[PDB]
């Protein structure tokens, strides 16, 4: 559709991040679909909480950036077909990037609410490579994270973000881990457009399918994953 404005908050590696240009897996997917569509595009970096309101007001045409498709979000916006698996977010101090793998988290302590699906996911995906500390609640896990007693926390992101905001901690940020274990697959990550924008949605879906078909998608995946 010749001109398309995308927005994200560039704070979620490896999906999106700051290279003063937005970079990352999602940024490359967006550039690739735009090329496929013969569209001219920009990616704007804006506060996470402003994105959906701005999409609804029509300031942007599309949102992306490690955005998990969820039933709740599907009530507010329309998503494309997913272009990668869903992400489990780890919350950690921004001063130290983490590689979210068995080797990258070697010697780290990860806090989690005990007995939850997040706890099971950590056990299955990391096994004995990490130390898991379990808490009665996400708040208790965060009390340890933000006093330096664990390295990262895994839990419900909207609740965690709410806690961090209420308690005036901007120091802690999210890192995305793609879920490769089919037992924990969700709908995936997708590009969001304004609810009812069927024309753009169809164009984006066709473009995503086309980059999958011509090898462009596979090369982008190989770059990051």
Ligand X SMILES: NC(=[NH2+])NCCC[C@H](N)C(=O)O
Q: Which residues bind ligand X (CB under 6 A)?
A: 8-9, 11-12, 16, 48, 65-68, 87, 89, 157, 174, 176
Whichever of 117 and 128 has its CB closer to ligand X, that residue is 117
> What is the number of the residue whose Cβ is closest to ligand X?
65
Whichever of 162 and 214 has its CB closer to ligand X, that residue is 162
Min CB(12)–ligand X separation in Å? 4
CB neighbourhood size of 160 (10 A): 21
Whichever of 38 and 96 has its CB closer to ligand X, that residue is 96
Checking 69-76 for CB contacts under 8 A at 24+ apart, the result is: 69/186, 69/187, 69/188, 69/189, 69/190, 70/186, 70/187, 73/192, 76/52, 76/195
Min CB(76)–ligand X separation in Å? 13
Min CB(142)–ligand X separation in Å? 16
Burial zone of 187 (CB within 10 Å; 0-12 exposed, 13-18 middle, 19+ buried): middle
Say if CB 89 and CB 221 are below 8 A apart: no
Min CB(214)–ligand X separation in Å? 27
């Amino acid at each position: 559709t010749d001109t398309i404005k995308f927005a994200t908050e560039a704070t979620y590696p490896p999906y999106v991040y700051m290279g003063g240009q937005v970079e990352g897996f999602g940024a490359d997917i967006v550039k690739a679909v735009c090329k496929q569509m013969q569209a001219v595009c920009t990616i704007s970096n804006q506060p996470w909480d402003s994105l959906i309101p701005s999409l609804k007001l029509g300031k942007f045409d599309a949102l992306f950036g490690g955005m998990n498709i969820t039933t709740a979000r599907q009530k507010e916006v329309d998503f494309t077909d997913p272009y990668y698996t869903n992400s489990v977010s780890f919350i950690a101090d921004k001063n130290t990037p983490l590689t979210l793998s068995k080797q990258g988290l070697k010697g780290k302590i990860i806090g989690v609410q005990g007995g939850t699906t997040f706890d099971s996911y950590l056990q299955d995906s990391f096994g004995n490579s990490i130390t898991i500390q379990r808490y009665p609640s996400e708040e208790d896990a965060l009390m340890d994270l933000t006093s330096g007693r664990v390295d990262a926390v895994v839990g419900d992101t909207p609740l965690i973000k709410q806690w961090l905001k209420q308690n005036g901690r901007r120091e802690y940020v999210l890192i995305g881990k793609p879920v490769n274990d089919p037992n924990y697959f969700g709908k995936g990550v997708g590009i969001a457009v304004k609810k009812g924008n069927q024309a753009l949605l169809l164009k984006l879906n066709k473009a995503l399918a086309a980059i999958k078909a011509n090898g462009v998608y596979a090369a982008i995946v190989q770059k990051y994953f």
